Every structure is written in C-alpha cells, then in structure tokens.
C-alpha cells in the first residue's frame, strides 16, 4: 500500500549547495574537513521496509547509513563525527530531522519540490540549502 514517505523513496544525487560552509562552521567543523566535504557530490538511497526508513549515503568523503522509525529517537554518528540523538518525524509531507548533542540542536528538513529533493539545514542563525535530483 502507498504511504506519505513514498515521494522520498529513491536514489538522490547532490546537485547544488547554498551556505554549506557557513553551516559546517556553525557546527564546529574544521577547515580541512569543510573543504573536502564541500567538494563532494554524495548519492543517497532512501528506502522503506515496513515502518523502517533507511538513508544510505555514499561519497568520496564518507559513507553513512541510518535506519529509523518515524518519531523514535535514535543514536547517530554524523559525517563530521558528532554523536547525536536524532528524531525524524513527518510534518505533513516534510521529513523533519532534529539532532541534539552537548546541549545544541540542528534541524534538517527534507521536502519534495518539483522533481527535486530539497534539504534545509538550520543551526543557530545559519540556514543551508542542499538540492538533490534523481539518479
Ligand atoms: O550530505 C551529507 O550526507 C552530509 C550532511 N547531511 C546533512 C543533512 C542531511 C543529510 C546529511 N551533513 C554533513 C555535515 Cl553536517 C558535515 C560534513 Cl563534514 C559532511 C556532511 C555531509 C556529507 C558531505 C559530503 C560527503 C558525505 C557527507
């Protein structure tokens, strides 16, 4: 049967970024990591099996995979090596991903817009946009 998350399922390749260096800086990412991460064009497979959503990313920099159930907090190690407590929820048709660590929080929103998957990343005053197309 069909589900709301269906529009996210697929293979997505990064095409563009706005304010990513600023966002990483706000997170405390060091110079060299910012430069190397900022060059990459990662690919992410988003799949669903029952209630479990998996996000599998492959790139020249880091490979990551997370699996989760909507609304259920989980442990995540981010590409910049933060050890966070994450929760991913649907807000209408937007996936909202909150990461908490050391009393800090960042919010990552995934939305479908035209044929794209658009990510909005917010840390304190900084907003970054990452745009993906199907691969
Ligand atoms: O796009 C990502 O998967 C991703 C990412 N994103 C954040 C939004 C949701 C998906 C994961 N956040 C990053 C951060 Cl906060 C720091 C660094 Cl140093 C690298 C990344 C990368 C990243 C960047 C380049 C290659 C691999 C992962």
From Swiss-Prot:
Consequence of changing residue 26 to D: In a breast cancer sample; somatic mutation
Keyword vocabulary terms for this entry: Acetylation, Cytoplasm, Lipid-binding, Nucleus, Phosphoprotein, Transport
Phosphotyrosine: modified positions: 23
GO biological processes: brown fat cell differentiation; cellular response to lithium ion; cellular response to tumor necrosis factor; cholesterol homeostasis; fatty acid transport; long-chain fatty acid transport; negative regulation of DNA-templated transcription; positive regulation of cold-induced thermogenesis
Residue numbers of N-acetylcysteine PTMs: 5
Chain segments annotated as coiled-coil in the UniProt record: none
GO CC aspect terms: cytoplasm; cytosol; extracellular exosome; lipid droplet; nucleus
SUPFAM superfamilies, alphabetized: Lipocalins (SSF50814)
Cell compartments where the protein resides: Cytoplasm; Nucleus
Entry function: Lipid transport protein in adipocytes. Binds both long chain fatty acids and retinoic acid. Delivers long-chain fatty acids and retinoic acid to their cognate receptors in the nucleus.
UniProt record similarity statement: Belongs to the calycin superfamily. Fatty-acid binding protein (FABP) family.
Recorded domain comment: Forms a beta-barrel structure that accommodates hydrophobic ligands in its interior.
Protein name listed in UniProt: Fatty acid-binding protein, adipocyte
Source organism per UniProt: Homo sapiens
Gene expressing this chain: FABP4
